[model samples]
Target: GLLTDYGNASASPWMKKLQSVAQGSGETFRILQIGDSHTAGDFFTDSLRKRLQKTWGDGGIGWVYPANVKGQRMAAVRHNGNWQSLTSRNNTGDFPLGGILAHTGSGGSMTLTASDGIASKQRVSLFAKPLLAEQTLTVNGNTVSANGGGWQVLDTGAALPLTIHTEMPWDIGFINIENPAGGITVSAMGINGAQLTQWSKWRADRMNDLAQTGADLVILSYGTNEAFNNNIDIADTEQKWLDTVRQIRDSLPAAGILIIGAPESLKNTLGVCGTRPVRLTEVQQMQRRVARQGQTMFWSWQNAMGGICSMKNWLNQGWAAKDGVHFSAKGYRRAAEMLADSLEELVRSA
Candidate 1:
């Protein structure tokens, strides 16, 4: 009824891991969910995160894209900085694990304040890459050298409010806040206007960065932006989606993957709003095919919304937003509940 085909959910490796965690094994089960604005909003993922954590335990804030990039939101922490944001859509640079890079030419400082869902005492770590030698990051007045060419972590110890000041230009990737007691962490890495090809076009070590998150289950929540593109080639999109799944599997061989189909959306046609974009249907179909072929799980958001023309109903119910592409706060909470229910079903079956 959820339009979710887990391919024998009880036998799924990730499901097994989740089952163990749900049974109070006291181990953290990390999930990395990547996608577009829907994922970036945090209303959906954060709600799901809170539900899962409430059932299991608080695993901490998980992986955080440290830079203050556009269209990015985090419920666990508040970040403020003067760093320049670089994205895969706007700049020709090495996209980080989150596909957004935050770097500064001159010296700049970033402050991270703990909010709700974060523990009073948490293990804070920073991931950054230095451009030149002698690049240093002062963490609360403690100088830490960032001379490495590739990504490196600076374990800043357990602190609530953290401060990072860099003199030279350095690439900031992610900052992870983990609980020492262990639980479940759902890291949502959604970029605005992101497509499936965005991750495909990232650096070869992008999956390596993902591996650092120690994610047991990786969820790709794309296709919304791709469906909006009227000129998209269905065949080519299928291939790209397949390729991205394979790439993730190759990098994280033990991790389980899930592909979330695009939710239903309506487009206005000459002042009337009832036309369902043809590409959206195509994208959902392609994703289902790829999920089966790629040996992954598939979840249909459209089906969750009750199939075709459901967005209109959701809007009428005051669950969706005026844009028709995104959901309102209440809608997101309900959507998260639906997803969590599905996941709990899988766990129970397992």
Candidate 2:
């Protein structure tokens, strides 16, 4: 079976919330998923989003980076323009909720087009920081003044193909779309080559940023990058993981937290022949322990893939990439389906 039972499902308070939503509560069940490349690909989360929304209802696309930045991707919308992507990895600055920022110089513009389900009967808002005071923007041919900071409503009951024209440099964070009539929304933030430590570098106010999402469940999917780093210490990494979970729990007291263990992957020792990194298994175990200690939900992606050294099988079936570190689009969709099924089971049992 591709799906394994969630660790500590009975104890998870958030499951009850999901159960209510599944039973036609007509309330939006918001989820915020943060991770590394696995999440940044958007295949996993997007697939899961569709599945859940189909069963529950369409709440709307939650938060998305305003542009198609390098190494980051978004579903349900298309974005393009002359924008430079920046991340907290190399920059020592306060990042927005998504941890990735976009900036553009004079005469620069970015356009966003919403997909079918996300386009109609929704409110679109922009979150940005102006490089200079009194900066202005042209959104969908309407001139608007940039806010001093934080989020601002761009359009209500808007249509697709929204464009923003800016004269001065501006730092862009995210654009949020929501339906006043709600069901479920999944807000995903993933950065390429990201590790849990990256969160530490972000400003403490990031907690406030996350709070704005009003997430019922916050999913932290990391450990793959940490496992690949040979210099990483198991004990220190465990402490760091615990601290990260604690911070989220402290900030969002009501939100249920889920920690996803790293999926099975192989390090190529020779051409097409590979072995599982011992550190990956260690990280998985450490994460399970941390989840238990923190009294949070835990999902083992490695287990879902059929345990240790399963990447070879996935590759043979064309479900995994040649790199062995990532999965094919079909593979990601399958994994998401399994996760969605498992989550439904949890809700039903609750």
Candidate 3:
């Protein structure tokens, strides 16, 4: 069964406040989930979102970056831009929010279009590296300055058709569009091939932008990409996980933290068929150990399915794709359901 070791799913004081706020207070209950491709899919997070919003209330759709940059598309948001996109997977830049970086000079622009269900009259915050020159921001076709650097807030209380222009090389990190009304806001952020250490490159200035969001909870859904290479030492990998947690904790000390275990995946077999690796189990344990020691919550996707070799069963059952790595849409939804059940149980039990 799912376990919280600590009180009320890690007994996070931050989350208790979120429940109180969501019940009646007019403030956003923000949760930022950082992961890899699974998170990029929105299958899991959106499912979790629908259930949480049903209980909490809708704060609105949150942060988003350029989807096409990674040769992938986001489920709910579409973006177009003449600027060059760089990510942690390939390029090197001091970008945050899992290293989803975009650069633009003169004559370049990026526009984001939001799908319905996202609230109207939302607030937009742009996080950019220190402006090399100056960038222009336009909300609903009205011109505005991106400000000197760091995070700048645009509270026009309007919906998109949001556009941004840059005249100098700008290292723009991810942009967050938020609803001012009280409720739950879940933001999904991940680079396609990002690893645990990928976030170590982030500077305090860049991270402070995320901190400013007043996120009550932060979720780390990592380890799948790291699982691909079996040569990596478990001790080192555990340190990487700890490092990332500490980095975020520095800014979000009061926020509840939840670490999702790496889902099952099949690896090369000694003989014929692909088999699940033992390292995945170790990684999950390490995640749980660190979460417990740090007073955070840990959700074990591994145990919920079965144990080792579970991916083989999942594959046999059509819950995962042919790649033997990622989950099918249905699988992600099931995962979401289980996670929501655990969280709801925790809150109610408290």
Candidate 4:
């Protein structure tokens, strides 16, 4: 998902070219990007989609996607490989959706299965477009879950199961997760300027609900909001960080959760009073610390890009709007690139 260090006006060409490469290789992917305005793609998500798809040519992010309404501005694409959105519509109405996927679907089959252990219900498959062969459904064997009632949809909210099933190989058991709906349901969850505490309330039962529904992985991105306005407390923030991870571990018995440090954001507020801080380089450091505590993979935006505030340059170049914090078309390209890189690596290892 697009975080700080995005909003570049020149990364568009690079992103489109990358998408084209992925598309040509017939590589399929599924993504759920969640972040602040950056991931929100304020203006950039759509722009980036148009420019990149111009060549790479595809809609919909990666797998286990969000739902689209009649006239939303966000450039969301729907397809096969069933997914349930946590839009501001449901109880978790605020489930943030962000990021652009390198490939469209990974969890195969437009059809979805019911997670009923007691009995069986007819399978459902209406993934609008295409569903990957590998991507399917899990019966959530564990007790923990995401917004429970019994058999919650492991679509976008909680940590879910997946093989990532990266590295193309001619095999029998594994479904070829090249296009739509197959393999693991991959999602990118990044909340804009969100505090770790906000998610602390995510309950143990919720994790059990996710497990009961068979969730494989959960990607956690934060630090931007903590570091956003000048109201952040570095010292106190660390404790909040540890507590958050501990909560997840205690709840989701065996689920894998990855934590990312905050990437650089456009800080035009003269360095401290405002949300846009031009010098919050430690954002990555903060995320790394949290990742270490949680034992998950860490993708450092600081390292991915050159350094802190690199995104501001993107704005000056016109990749962003009035508030340097948000991104424009070209900016999202860079964000997608970074995410694509991290995700690709994860898949390969998987």
Per-residue lDDT of model 1, residues 1-350, tens digit only? 56366455567666777777777787788888988888888888999899989988888888877766676688778888887777776667776677777885567888887677443666667768888765777877778885557776667665557778888788887788878778888888888888988775677778778767778888899888888889999998888888888888877877888888888887752233477776888878888999999878888888888887788888878899877878998898898888888887767665
Runs with alpha carbons beyond 4 Å of true place in candidate 2? 1-13, 89-92, 133-157, 269-274
Over the stretch 148-243, how does candidate 3's per-residue lDDT look in tens digits? 666444344457756776655666666677767768877877667666676766554655766776778888898787777667688887877777
Model 4 CA deviation exceeding 4 Å by range:
1-34, 42-181, 188-193, 200-204, 250-255, 269-283, 343-350
Candidate 3 vs candidate 4, lDDT winner: 3
lDDT of each: 0.79, 0.77, 0.71, 0.40
Candidates' TM-scores?
0.92, 0.88, 0.88, 0.51
* Candidate order (lDDT): 1, 2, 3, 4
Off by over 4 Å in 1: 6-8, 117-121, 141-143, 153-156, 269-273
Output the number of the lDDT-best candidate. 1
Model 2, TM vs. native: 0.88
Candidate number of the best TM-score: 1
Local accuracy of candidate 2 as per-residue lDDT tens digits, 101-134: 7887788898877676545546666667777665
RMSD to the true structure for each prediction, in A, is 2.3, 3.0, 2.8, 13.6
